[PDB]
Amino acid sequence: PNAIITAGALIGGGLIMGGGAIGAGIGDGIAGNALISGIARQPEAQGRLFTPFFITVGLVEAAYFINLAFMALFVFATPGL
Amino acid sequence: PNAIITAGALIGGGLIMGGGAIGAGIGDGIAGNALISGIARQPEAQGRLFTPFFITVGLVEAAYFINLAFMALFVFATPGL
Amino acid sequence: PNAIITAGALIGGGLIMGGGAIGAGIGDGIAGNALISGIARQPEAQGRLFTPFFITVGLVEAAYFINLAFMALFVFATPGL
Amino acid sequence: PNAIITAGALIGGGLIMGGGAIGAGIGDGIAGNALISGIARQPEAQGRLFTPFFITVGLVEAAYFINLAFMALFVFATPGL
Amino acid sequence: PNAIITAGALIGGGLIMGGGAIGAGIGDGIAGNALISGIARQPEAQGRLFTPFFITVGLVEAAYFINLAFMALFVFATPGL
Amino acid sequence: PNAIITAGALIGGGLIMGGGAIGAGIGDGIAGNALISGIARQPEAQGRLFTPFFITVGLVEAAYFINLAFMALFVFATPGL
Amino acid sequence: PNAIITAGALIGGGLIMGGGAIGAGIGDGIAGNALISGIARQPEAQGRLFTPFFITVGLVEAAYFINLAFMALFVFATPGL
Amino acid sequence: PNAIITAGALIGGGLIMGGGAIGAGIGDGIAGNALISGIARQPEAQGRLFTPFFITVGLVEAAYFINLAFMALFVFATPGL
Amino acid sequence: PNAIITAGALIGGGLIMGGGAIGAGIGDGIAGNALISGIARQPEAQGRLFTPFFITVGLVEAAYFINLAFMALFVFATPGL
Amino acid sequence: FLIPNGTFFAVLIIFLIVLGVISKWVVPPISKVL
Amino acid sequence: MSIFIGQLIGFAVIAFIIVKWVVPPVRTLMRNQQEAVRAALAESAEAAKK
Amino acid sequence: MEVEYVGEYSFEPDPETLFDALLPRYIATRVYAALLEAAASES
Amino acid sequence: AIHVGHHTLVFELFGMTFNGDTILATAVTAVIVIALAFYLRAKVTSTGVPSGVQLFWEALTIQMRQQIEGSIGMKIAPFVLPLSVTIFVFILISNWLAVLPLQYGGGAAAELYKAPASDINFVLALALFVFVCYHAAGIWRRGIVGHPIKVVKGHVAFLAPINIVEELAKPISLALRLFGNIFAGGILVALIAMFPWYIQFPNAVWKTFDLFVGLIQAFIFSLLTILYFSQSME
Amino acid sequence: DLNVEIVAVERELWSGPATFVFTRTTAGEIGILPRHIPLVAQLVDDAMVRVEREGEDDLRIAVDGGFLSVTEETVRILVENAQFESEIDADAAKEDAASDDERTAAWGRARLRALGQ
Numbered sequence A, B, C, D, E, F, G, H, I: 001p002n003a004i005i006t007a008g009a010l011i012g013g014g015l016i017m018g019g020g021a022i023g024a025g026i027g028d029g030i031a032g033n034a035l036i037s038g039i040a041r042q043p044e045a046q047g048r049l050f051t052p053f054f055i056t057v058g059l060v061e062a063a064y065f066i067n068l069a070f071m072a073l074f075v076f077a078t079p080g081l
Numbered sequence J: 001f002l003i004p005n006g007t008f009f010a011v012l013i014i015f016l017i018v019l020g021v022i023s024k025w026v027v028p029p030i031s032k033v034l
Numbered sequence K: 001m002s003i004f005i006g007q008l009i010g011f012a013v014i015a016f017i018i019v020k021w022v023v024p025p026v027r028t029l030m031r032n033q034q035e036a037v038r039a040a041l042a043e044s045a046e047a048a049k050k
Numbered sequence L: 001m002e003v004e005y006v007g008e009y010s011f012e013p014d015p016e017t018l019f020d021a022l023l024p025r026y027i028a029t030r031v032y033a034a035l036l037e038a039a040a041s042e043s
Numbered sequence M: 001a002i003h004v005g006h007h008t009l010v011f012e013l014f015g016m017t018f019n020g021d022t023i024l025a026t027a028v029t030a031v032i033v034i035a036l037a038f039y040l041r042a043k044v045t046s047t048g049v050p051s052g053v054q055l056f057w058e059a060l061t062i063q064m065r066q067q068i069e070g071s072i073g074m075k076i077a078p079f080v081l082p083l084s085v086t087i088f089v090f091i092l093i094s095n096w097l098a099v100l101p102l103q104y105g106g107g108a109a110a111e112l113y114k115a116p117a118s119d120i121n122f123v124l125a126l127a128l129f130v131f132v133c134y135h136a137a138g139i140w141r142r143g144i145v146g147h148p149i150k151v152v153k154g155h156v157a158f159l160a161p162i163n164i165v166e167e168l169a170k171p172i173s174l175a176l177r178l179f180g181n182i183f184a185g186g187i188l189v190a191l192i193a194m195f196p197w198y199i200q201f202p203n204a205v206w207k208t209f210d211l212f213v214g215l216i217q218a219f220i221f222s223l224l225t226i227l228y229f230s231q232s233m234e
Numbered sequence N: 001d002l003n004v005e006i007v008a009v010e011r012e013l014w015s016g017p018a019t020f021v022f023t024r025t026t027a028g029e030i031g032i033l034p035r036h037i038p039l040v041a042q043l044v045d046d047a048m049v050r051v052e053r054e055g056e057d058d059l060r061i062a063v064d065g066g067f068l069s070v071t072e073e074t075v076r077i078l079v080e081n082a083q084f085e086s087e088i089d090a091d092a093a094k095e096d097a098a099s100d101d102e103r104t105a106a107w108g109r110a111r112l113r114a115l116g117q
């Protein structure tokens, strides 16, 4: 009984982390694209672009962290186990 | 019977959170790309731009958080259990 | 029988809802990118870009919410049994 | 036998709906990005850009709505029962 | 045994249509983004822009419809049944 | 035994064509977006752009059709079995 | 025992060719987008653009064909029997 | 019971790495696209763009390698075994 | 028991390479888009654009080969077997 | 594998030693040279 | 031994690659930088002498 | 040149580089107009 | 089959377990770095043509100073220069040393020198030292009362929950990015060891990536350390 | 329909109606039909222009460092110096296109593009 629940929890946590990594990596790359383009256009922008950038990064990685948290709730803890 | 339903609920919640995180991360990165590009091109529009930004993020995160709401319902309430 | 059907319904509903989340998040991010960029280039367009925006979002949200409905039809109701 | 086929049909319909929703949301967002950018650039272009837009959406949403019908076929009146 | 084969065929057809819908929606949205952008930039070129458009669509939709055809083979013919 | 192998082959072929459809649709949409943007820019260039456009479409469709042939191998000539 | 291993290997190979086709199609479309755009802006640039193109395509197609080889492994020489 | 959990952990870790690799590859490609475009526009950018670029990569790789760490936990130290 | 673990390892490795192929192909295509566009804009920049390119590729390909590693771990050295 | 142990300190000290040698006999001489 | 021989051949191949394609450029850079240092020294020399 | 505000468009490749390339052209045009005005006045 | 962990020379002292192989690899890279430092001292000159090690040290210090000055001038953070440089070489020499032909057959594959970054202890030591150091710098510059306040506040106040987590993420990722990059490699080169010698070309291809990726990881680790200092020091 | 005003600092060159106008801006090739979005662009130093209108042949212009402005009715092409196809000399342009001076070489290449190749 608990074996099936544990396997399902592992698969669910893998899905959580895979989706979180896709979202975080792609969103961070997209935001860094704007950051790099802005710094290339204006080197002084180096200073001011990290504030909009690190807001984005953080919002983008929120979903990664919350997902991560619930994955810790899936494999270590396990609802219904 | 409960073991199979619990494994299915865990897998479904994992799919929900993976998709939600993919959408959230990628959409937040895309919106922050526009924010960063606009702030680089027009430094004085920072405050002008955080309104349409946090709106769009607010939409994207909404899509995420609804999904999270459901995931709990999947793993803790588990309809059909 | 109901155990397997319910597990399959949970997995299917998770797929529905996660796909809707991916689509909604990414589409909202893409539309918000255009909104933010246009507002950056045009302070006044703030008023007039909310009409093309909320229409696009209206579509992007629509596909999302429909999924939600069907997801409920998958999990709360069960078409099979 | 019927339970296994029902679970498979639910999973397949969920995959159909997830794919349809991803396509619909992302395509609608991409089309609305062009619509918003054009209406920001030229504000009088609105009436001109709703014909190219609703065509694209008409295609995009079409792919979505087809997936609905087949989903129903998968979910209601499951083939091969 | 057919039960297992039929469930696998339903899942496979669902995957086929999910992928076809994702591709169709996203490609149609991308092509319509170019169509809208061009018709915004060059209002008088609609006729010269729709031929490349319906060609592009004619490609992506083909990929969709071909997939749809094979879905039927999976769902109604079930070659391995 | 075959029923399990047949179901696995059907799911594998479903993934095969789902990925083929996603790749084909999105790549063809991107290539057609480039073609339409180029023709709007320079409406007299329609003839010139078909060669790079058809080369790109040929590469994408070669990938798609090699994948559709491998689905055919999976389904009608399932390896092993 | 062998049937389950073969079904799992077929599902794995279907996932590998599906991901490979997604990557190949989308990357080839993205590269051909740049090729078509550059040849639209610079009609004479074709000569110099097919070298960076076939290089990048050479990478992308490589990622495809590698997968193809390994998928044959999975399905013809399936390890772990 | 351990065999089921091991198979589930392998599938979960495979999902973790699939998502991590998708995110890493796509985000790194986007960041490198920004870097290459910026260096093409303004050659001396070579000097200043490797700072924001390797930050973006540093953000893109994190979500990948963290997943990889959680893969090792899934595969070599299965939490629920 | 070893049959189930082998099937799970095969599915996990298939997911690993599917994600790795998607990431590698799409990232290589995105980087090649920038390379082709820059060499179109600046024909003499080709020599200077390879260093940013092959670095970017060197990243994404790494993420590919790391996946190629952990597939070989899953398939040929199945942990937990 | 992911659980730390005493090595965490053993490495740290060594790193600090390096951080010393570089911070005294490398960085200041190089800054003076530049 | 077989593992050792294989990894040693791989190390030899990578060493040859770096020595034939990575060593030459880096070396140049080092020489060009040295040129510079000596030159600057000597230029201070001549400026002071002059 | 001073900036005068009057009261109550797409760009290729960007408006700032176009402005940089056009200001010298504007100065050349104004110098040319001054030269023609001087020639007419001289005659 | 592949193994994870299985450290050699493991011992126990002061009630704590120590991975002898990881400590030995760290000591080897540390002594190589110290030898480079002392050879510079013995052969550092500003009045003459620079030595090779002198050129290397000048280039690394100039790069790190360029990154520092562009985010946080050395008038505020002069101490992060001797740090960012060492973190680089300590990591770089740690990774490139794994490129030596020190892999053999037990029949399980083994390596005399395994990259310290492949051990969670090494990466955690480096990352937590950086964490403590730049948090101390932030406390110094903003005060023990103001530093946590500005950390929680961040650039956007209402995003406070997304700030604190990110602050706790910085070290972990900073470690896990380094470990996962190298630990993974330790498996790849072990998997390549399953090939016969005449097929076992894959080591050349991967070794070059290991050189490339180890250089990239040293650079990224040091540059993210500099960025963390720039953020925590206002 | 379009009306194209190819104007030089010295004087105007042509202002009659047209159906299609095509030229190489610094961002790439571009073509304009009526009702085009308002635009401002710089032509490449060797830019050549082609105008097509009812009945009459293709009007090809060798343009030196011009600027293209698109207005809701007009399309104007400012030029430092522009020369019609009927006025160019092939041998002189061939000789000048190889000139060391960047401006002279660009002008010669523009004149050649006005003829072809």
Ligand SMILES: O=c1c(NCc2ccccn2)c(-c2ccc(N3CCOCC3)cc2)c1=O
Residues within 6 Å of the ligand: A024, A054, A055, A057, A058, A059, A061, A064, A065, H058, H059, H062, H063, H066, M154, M155, M156, M162, M163, M166, M169, M170, M173, M174, M224, M227
């Ligand atoms: O690396 C670095 C990294 N994130 C990588 C990562 C870790 C775990 C999961 C996913 N991704 C960050 C980082 C640092 C600060 C930050 N903000 C500060 C301002 O307020 C908003 C938050 C956001 C991000 C790295 O530096």
